[PDB]
UniProtKB/Swiss-Prot annotation, chain A:
The encoding gene: Atp6v1f
PANTHER family to which the protein is assigned, alphabetical: V-TYPE PROTON ATPASE SUBUNIT F (PTHR13861:SF2), VACUOLAR ATP SYNTHASE SUBUNIT F (PTHR13861)
Subcellular location as annotated: Cytoplasmic vesicle, Secretory vesicle, Synaptic vesicle membrane; Cytoplasmic vesicle, Clathrin-coated vesicle membrane
GO biological process: synaptic vesicle lumen acidification
Name listed for the protein in its UniProt record: V-type proton ATPase subunit F
Location (main, coarse): membrane
Domain of life: Eukaryota
Subunit structure: V-ATPase is a heteromultimeric enzyme made up of two complexes: the ATP-hydrolytic V1 complex and the proton translocation V0 complex. The V1 complex consists of three catalytic AB heterodimers that form a heterohexamer, three peripheral stalks each consisting of EG heterodimers, one central rotor including subunits D and F, and the regulatory subunits C and H. The proton translocation complex V0 consists of the proton transport subunit a, a ring of proteolipid subunits c9c'', rotary subunit d, subunits e and f, and the accessory subunits ATP6AP1/Ac45 and ATP6AP2/PRR.
A Pfam family the protein falls into: ATP-synt_F
UniProtKB/Swiss-Prot annotation, chain D:
Shown segment, full-protein numbering: 257 to 506 of 511
Upper taxonomic lineage: Eukaryota, Metazoa, Chordata, Craniata, Vertebrata
Binding site for ATP: 144
Family recorded in the similarity comment: Belongs to the ATPase alpha/beta chains family.
The protein's name in its UniProt record: V-type proton ATPase subunit B, brain isoform
Chief place where the protein resides: membrane
Originating species: Rattus norvegicus (Rat)
An annotated GO BP: ATP metabolic process
Tissue and organ expression note: Expressed in brain (at protein level).
Record's keyword terms, sorted: ATP-binding, Cell membrane, Cytoplasm, Cytoplasmic vesicle, Hydrogen ion transport, Ion transport, Membrane, Nucleotide-binding, Synapse, Transport
Record note on quaternary structure: V-ATPase is a heteromultimeric enzyme made up of two complexes: the ATP-hydrolytic V1 complex and the proton translocation V0 complex. The V1 complex consists of three catalytic AB heterodimers that form a heterohexamer, three peripheral stalks each consisting of EG heterodimers, one central rotor including subunits D and F, and the regulatory subunits C and H. The proton translocation complex V0 consists of the proton transport subunit a, a ring of proteolipid subunits c9c'', rotary subunit d, subunits e and f, and the accessory subunits ATP6AP1/Ac45 and ATP6AP2/PRR.
GO MF term set: ATP binding; proton-transporting ATPase activity, rotational mechanism
Gene Ontology CC: apical plasma membrane; clathrin-coated vesicle membrane; cytoplasm; cytosol; extrinsic component of synaptic vesicle membrane; melanosome; microvillus; plasma membrane
Length: 110, 153, 214, 250, 153
């Protein structure tokens, strides 16, 4: 009931989660996700990210690492707890490790 | 003297002193941790101790009701407040580690009018009102509290 | 600055000694709060390290499973993306009372609304069903992952704030109380001396007067 | 009992000889009549005040905090007239009792006394306000001669071991209780709960006694073991295994 | 006296005392907090107060330029320091609630040359450079600051 999980990612990533049972339409028919294609620009991703932060029903947002790099300033600029953002490897991009917020917060971790 | 005439004062006196001292020690940490973690009994001690400090140990000596409080009334007031303490402590500790856990917040919502009556006991006004009635009125508060916890449990 | 600037007195000694005891007790109680937060943080650090690694491996399997579903079905992604209405999984807020500080955590909530039933493309239902399960597992891990991360960030701020307060007591407030108390003690002994001097001279003057009378 | 009463409204000079008469009797009884004498000197602080008055009567210039410069030797003169002597079976012990002005152990009266005595009992206030009798706080107390007082042939084999383990358990229980106030009951582990249970039952059963219950040393140790058997053997780190095997069970 | 000959001196004296007192009120708590909870308006007070302390309140009496400080110079350079305070405080007060707040780090980098010039104002050598040069120099720095704010805000 409480919170939804929003997803900003590529075609396969979003599709997988939607099948995972997560994600739905709001009463205004808005979707809590964005499919990011090669023709998707920076303003669309950034504006979408911000709006999810401006919605009280969302909270956890799942983003592909390569996307986080495109709009990185927006993910470090906002430091709160509702918008917990997890960065995940895309189907083809490799496993994440560098520039991870947590590996940076903790100076005792790989 | 106390055991000859009253028999109740000595044990009420002991418990009253324990509560006031316990409150001072709890107050020292609450000022530091903000009640982040308290046992249900500890929350009762703090709130009953405030009941005592404000509605038993505090009095306006220039009012008809508190110019002089006769001893039978002083012990009457203390008897009910401690009786509440023991019943509130039993309820939360008896139902602890179970399903229908009782807490102080639940007690206040369930029998809030009991705390109103307890805080009003200073106003029974001796001499204007009779000794026999004031004792009977305090007995009524005890009976109401006892039934309130029975229905809560 | 260097002292609380309370005029030397026996009253000041009593207040400063009580103030010092209070500061020392607060230091120890806050140190215990810090130690409790540090253990949970370190336990939470290990939990997050175990999670993030697993997340990678789970996505590797899920991505392959998706390719398998795609192989059989062909282009199911279009139907899934367009035909969206209700979620089966939702997240509930919970509070974690780790110490005096309370941290926000997420908890997985299986709301239960049925997911879309898809056998339309090559009827690849078994691959889609395994794919749902693979991502379902991913979702639960990610929820825990975030929840651990949020509680962790709040605790790390809590540790730095608590340790900073403890350090100030030790390096600023107590040294200052101890300097004040030592100042008070010294000045009071100085007052005792000048009283001694005057009383001694009074006794000698009395003896001198007595000698004159003889 | 040989009882000397010097009342608050009695001559203040008589208050000075009173402890001298008490010790004079103690010396006669102990050393000439071959017996053991326990001497209890109550309210040495009132003695010290009477002594200051005598100094003023002599027109002496007051010393530290108004007391005579010879308060040190005067207290030693009384205190040290005690102990065992070679070739005789008598002895004198003392339990001076002193009120701390403004509850400050630094005050010359308890300071000059303690500086020349062997340990302290130390009665607290918090234990009294909590309605515990006797209100004696075991953590700040010390008896430097306990090592010789107790042991096989004097009390019981396990005396020293029970004392050391109980002291550590009480100190730890207080430490856990302080933790509980910060983290709560649910944040405690099983060992911490055992220390909390010990603390509550230690004060209620072992320290709390009542004025008319006479507990001999052997019952006191047995009560100690009842508290120690709360813990499994592995947590009783200060008691050798030989002692545990003999006394711990049952 | 001051009203007859200067007028501007008295409100400048008051503002300077308020800044120094506010800095002291902050230093007491900042030592404990670590400059974490400070508002942008408070950081301006702290840094301008430093400006006043280091450049205005102290002077090296064994130099050709601080051996004597004619009164007109003291009030002249104070006017600039306070004028900076008011312009910096206004700059943030009018923008903190907008879509871009002029925090200390923005004004510091934009006007870093002004902050150095303000510190150099003591090095005027009234014996070599007389009243006319000192007043013209101080007036020019005030104009330079005013132009910097217009381009900043």
């Amino acid at each position: 009931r409480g919170k939804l999980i929003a997803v900003i990612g590529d075609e396969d990533t979003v599709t997988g989660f939607l099948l995972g049972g997560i994600g739905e339409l709001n009463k205004n028919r808005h979707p809590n996700f964005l499919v990011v294609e090669k023709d998707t620009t920076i303003n669309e991703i950034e504006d979408t990210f911000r709006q999810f932060l401006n919605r009280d029903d969302i909270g956890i947002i799942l983003i592909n690492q390569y996307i986080a790099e495109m709009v990185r300033h927006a993910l470090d600029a906002h430091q709160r707890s509702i918008p917990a953002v997890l960065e995940i490897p895309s189907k083809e991009h490799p496993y994440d490790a560098a520039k991870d917020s947590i590996l940076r917060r903790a100076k005792g971790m790989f | 003297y106390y055991d000859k005439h009253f028999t109740e004062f000595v044990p009420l006196r002991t418990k009253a002193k324990e509560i006031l001292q316990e409150e001072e020690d709890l107050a020292e940490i609450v000022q530091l941790v903000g009640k982040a973690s308290l046992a249900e009994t500890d929350k009762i001690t703090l709130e009953v101790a405030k009941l005592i400090k404000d509605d038993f140990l505090q009095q306006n000596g220039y009012t008809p009701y508190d110019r002089f409080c006769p001893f039978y009334k002083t012990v009457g007031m203390l008897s009910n407040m401690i009786s509440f303490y023991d019943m509130a402590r039993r309820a939360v500790e008896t139902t602890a580690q179970s399903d229908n856990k009782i807490t102080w917040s639940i007690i206040r919502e369930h029998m809030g009018e009991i705390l109103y009556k307890l805080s009003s006991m200073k106003f029974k006004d001796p001499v204007k009102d009779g000794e026999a009635k004031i004792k009977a009125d305090y007995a009524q508060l005890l009976e109401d509290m006892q039934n309130a916890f029975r229905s809560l449990e | 600055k260097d002292r609380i600037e309370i005029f030397p007195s026996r009253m000041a000694q009593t207040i400063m000694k009580a103030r010092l005891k209070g500061a020392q007790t607060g230091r120890n109680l806050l140190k215990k709060k810090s130690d409790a937060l540090t253990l949970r943080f370190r336990q939470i650090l290990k939990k997050i390290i175990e999670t993030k690694m697993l997340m990678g491996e789970v996505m590797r399997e899920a991505a392959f499973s998706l390719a398998e579903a795609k192989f059989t079905a062909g282009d199911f992604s279009t139907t899934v993306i367009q035909n969206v209405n209700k979620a089966q999984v939702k997240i509930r807020a919970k509070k974690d009372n780790v110490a005096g500080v309370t941290l926000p955590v997420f908890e997985h909530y299986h709301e239960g609304t049925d997911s879309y039933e898809l056998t339309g493309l090559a009827r690849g239902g078994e691959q889609l069903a395994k794919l749902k399960r693979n991502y379902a597992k991913a979702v639960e891990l990610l929820v825990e992952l975030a929840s651990l991360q949020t509680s962790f960030v709040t605790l790390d701020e809590a540790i730095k704030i608590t340790n900073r307060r403890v350090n100030a007591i030790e390096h600023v407030i107590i040294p200052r109380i101890e300097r004040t108390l030592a100042y008070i003690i010294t000045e009071l002994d100085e007052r005792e001396r000048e009283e001694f001097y005057r009383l001694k001279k009074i006794q000698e003057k009395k003896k001198i007067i007595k000698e004159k009378s003889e | 009992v040989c009882l000397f009463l010097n009342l608050a409204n009695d001559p203040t000079i008589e208050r000075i000889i009173t402890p001298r008469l008490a010790l004079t009797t103690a010396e006669f009884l102990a050393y000439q009549c071959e017996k053991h004498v326990l001497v209890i000197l109550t309210d040495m602080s009132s003695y010290a005040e009477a002594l200051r008055e005598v100094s003023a009567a002599r027109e002496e210039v007051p010393g530290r905090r108004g007391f005579p410069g010879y308060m040190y030797t005067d207290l030693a003169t009384i205190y040290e007239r005690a102990g065992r002597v070679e070739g005789r079976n008598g002895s004198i012990t003392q339990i001076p009792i002193l009120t701390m002005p403004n509850d400050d152990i630094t005050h010359p009266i308890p300071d000059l006394t303690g500086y020349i005595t062997e340990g302290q009992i130390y009665v607290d206030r918090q234990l009294h306000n909590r309605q515990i009798y006797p209100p004696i706080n075991v953590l700040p107390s010390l008896s430097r001669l306990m090592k010789s007082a107790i042991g096989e042939g004097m009390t019981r084999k396990d005396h020293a071991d029970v004392s050391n383990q109980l002291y550590a358990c009480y100190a730890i229980g207080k430490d856990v209780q302080a933790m509980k106030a910060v983290v709560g009951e649910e944040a405690l582990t099983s060992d911490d709960l055992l220390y909390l249970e010990f603390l509550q039952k230690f004060e209620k059963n072992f320290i709390t006694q009542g004025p008319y219950e006479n507990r001999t040393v052997y019952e006191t140790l047995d009560i100690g073991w009842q508290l120690l058997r709360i813990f499994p053997k592995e947590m009783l780190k200060r008691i050798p295994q030989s002692t545990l095997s003999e006394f711990y069970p049952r």
